[PDB]
Write a protein that binds this ligand. Structure first.
Ligand code: HEM
Ligand code: HEM
Ligand SMILES: NC(=[NH2+])NCCC[C@H](N)C(=O)O
Ligand SMILES: NC(=[NH2+])NCCC[C@H](N)C(=O)O
Ligand SMILES: [Zn+2]
Lengths: 402, 403
């Protein structure tokens, strides 16, 4: 019995047979569904490694050659003697792309084949991590013509502490907790802001202060590195027809570079492996600026637009959000920085699902994350049933290192 | 942590554990390997469903273990013993109906669950009589615009003997006429039932908003056709509070949403005809019904009137039009004095319901994809609330179409 998956807008049906290859577990059982939840030996490492080596040789269509068997022997010999093994650059490149491809929450996977992979496994200090991170940013930003990248730092080792980037993204704005309860800047970054200050960073007092990085080499206290302002491209927000909107002094950074997830390839774990593509506009316009526990600017905007704030039924919240998202798109386009709107992103994801159906017999997708945060049923993904499951290589959550 | 699903609200940072889900009788469609949450779709067996139900009834009047409780159990097993089935006391039926609603994971209006008028119609014995009960239900629920939640219950499934069925999916629905050019006039969701009404002798209209007749089936009989008298069907013409031309589009919606094709299951007993109605939340009309591409699909038309750039996704024309359509729905209903609730007020009230149910029952089964509204999602507090979905009984369940 395999999942029948229906698109309700077109009446079409597919069957997901790729989920059979799931060896990892989602949070659900048959007695209760936990899907909307945001967070969750050597022959076993070996069996994940053989499997991953199998994927890789199949990918280059050498699925049986001398090379294939000799490579499995290498991996077997290395695990038998040392309890672990190492990946070849080109396996690593293939694993990273496959991790992205398999990421159920990513709407931008049409892009999965085009990922610049920086091998930083020859990295031995916080200082080197920083240099690599700077290269990553410079490459990925590309004066606003954004390019997808990942930089992979040295894998976890049974002996020692992990390499980690303590920040959750490479670029984030500071959130300064007030004694009077409230937050100046981004409330989601209060804890990382506090951490930075105590490892000796001099704070600013703005709404949009770019945080320094805390980089940790194994079993060493993390170190502080301030990003060179010229590396951090930012887009001031204005609105195409509302002149007052610019007066709000809103801005956002160009580069979304997630730096806290663990990358897992054939049983090996890469605890520092920051990755970036480009923003979908609703991430900034709806979530970051309008979430009540984020910058929460909807009321400010509604009042400027002169809307009736006293009642939910004037749909003031909805009207303001739409203008905010429009401002984000307009500003990014004016500054010539890559962005995709939620309509174009979901249309391309549909094409991706279809590609994936033909190529693998299904696609892991997390509906609550693929459907955008405004205008859901106005996008084709709303009407598309979706099956969520964990394939490996995978990006996974890991504990905060402090 | 305790050994139960942990549930987080990401706006407020708060945690709860669902203990209620451990009372779940029915498997959902998920396994450890794969999540199917986004998907839209006897002897001792009866006795134990019955027993469990009667226990629920006695708890809710706080007489668990009492002699009246043990006598009812005995009465129910004896009745099953001799007939294969049993019957509910009136007050059990009322409790089971409210509890089915309360249990419904997809319903965001459940803060209202305790206030349901239960019309007992288990004496009903003909299609004509279904019609009278249905008309009575509509008059009572509609209440000239001040809507009142209600359910009418017809006789339960009975061994061998045929079912009572309402063929229509709601008591009030608009016709969908399949055109020569292959397109649809009216509501494309209603094509099959439209065509069925024609097959059974209905003389079809040709409007975009033709109210369907009812096709009602008493046991072992072909369905009979009944035309609702127009004046029982309240409708709201749509206008916009500032865009004057919107009224000129001639759009309208009916006031009463009355789902009629679901099965109400109580203590193993099956009520195959049990239509229920509340009032609308505005996004069901303004977003789904009017803007779904496979429904009325009016988004482009509205956007063109609003002079928006429809050649490019990045103008947000879809988003701007959809907002105005929802504002029109809200505004028109308020002007016509017909009950309606917006998706902000609804979700707030549903957060409050979740909190009540946390204290009362230790959880609340909720289907996130259906609870979050189809526009402005993360603008509502339910978006940031994790939810656990499972089936409790009494339940409203899907059932195959009678044909
Ligand atoms: C190319 C442009 C891309 C776009 C437009 C995009 C879009 C998105 C969006 C909207 C999300 C949901 C994230 C959130 O709401 O916080 C997401 C999640 C994610 N994407 Fe992408 N993505 C892109 C590229 C990438 C790349 C290059 C990778 C890695 C190689 C990646 C891996 C992920 C992962 C692992 C998640 C889940 C993050 C989490 O669980 O918090 N994506 N993507
Ligand atoms: C009192 C006002 C009510 C409101 C605002 C309301 C709101 C809603 C909404 C928005 C849905 C989603 C339906 C869809 O997207 O098609 C729904 C589903 C549902 N509601 Fe309500 N509801 C109300 C009253 C009722 C009543 C009185 C009952 C039954 C006694 C009920 C039982 C249901 C059930 C069973 C569903 C699921 C239907 C399905 O799965 O297709 N609700 N509710
Ligand atoms: N486009 C990506 N690679 N996104 C990953 C998540 C970024 C996150 N949504 C943010 O608002 O900053
Ligand atoms: N409020 C209710 N009882 N809703 C049941 C669903 C009605 C359906 N969404 C409609 O728009 O016609
Ligand atoms: Zn699930």
């Amino acid at each position: 019995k395999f999942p029948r998956v229906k698109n309700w807008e077109l009446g079409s049906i597919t069957y997901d047979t790729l989920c059979a290859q799931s060896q990892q577990d989602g949070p659900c059982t048959p007695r209760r569904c936990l899907g909307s939840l945001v967070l969750p030996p050597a022959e076993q490492l070996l069996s994940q490694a053989r499997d991953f080596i199998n994927q890789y040789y199949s990918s280059i269509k050498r699925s049986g050659s001398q090379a294939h068997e000799e490579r499995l022997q290498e991996v077997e010999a290395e695990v038998a003697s040392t309890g672990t093994y190492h990946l070849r650059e080109s396996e690593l490149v293939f694993g990273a792309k496959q991790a992205w491809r398999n990421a159920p929450r990513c709407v931008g996977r049409i892009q999965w084949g085009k990922l610049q992979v920086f091998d930083a496994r020859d990295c031995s200090s916080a200082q080197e991590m920083f240099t690599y991170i700077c290269n990553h940013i410079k490459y990925a930003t590309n004066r606003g013509n954004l390019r997808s990248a990942i930089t992979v730092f040295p894998q976890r080792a049974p002996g020692r502490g992990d390499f980690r980037i303590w920040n959750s993204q490479l670029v984030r704005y500071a959130g300064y907790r007030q004694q009077d309860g409230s937050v100046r800047g981004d409330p989601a970054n209060v804890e990382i802001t506090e951490l930075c200050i105590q490892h000796g960073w001099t704070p600013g007092n703005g709404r949009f202060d770019v945080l320094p990085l805390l980089l940790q080499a194994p079993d060493e206290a993390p170190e502080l590195f301030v990003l060179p302002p010229e590396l951090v491209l930012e887009v001031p927000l204005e609105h195409p027809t509302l002149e007052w909107f610019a007066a709000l002094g809103l801005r956002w950074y160009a580069l979304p570079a997630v730096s806290n997830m663990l990358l897992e390839i054939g049983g090996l774990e890469f605890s520092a492996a920051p990755f970036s593509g480009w923003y979908m506009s609703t991430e900034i316009g709806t979530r970051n600026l309008c979430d009540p526990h984020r910058y929460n600017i909807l009321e400010d905007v509604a009042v400027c637009m002169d809307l009736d704030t006293r009642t939910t039924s004037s749909l003031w919240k909805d009207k303001a959000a739409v203008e905010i998202n429009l401002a984000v798109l307009h500003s990014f386009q004016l500054a010539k920085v890559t962005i995709v709107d939620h309509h174009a992103a979901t249309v391309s994801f549909m094409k991706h699902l279809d590609n994936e159906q033909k190529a693998r017999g299904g696609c892991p997708a997390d509906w609550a994350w693929i459907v955008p945060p405004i205008s859901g049923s106005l996008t084709p993904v709303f009407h598309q049933e979706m099956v969520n499951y964990i394939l490996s290589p995978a990006f996974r959550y890991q504990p905060d290192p402090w």
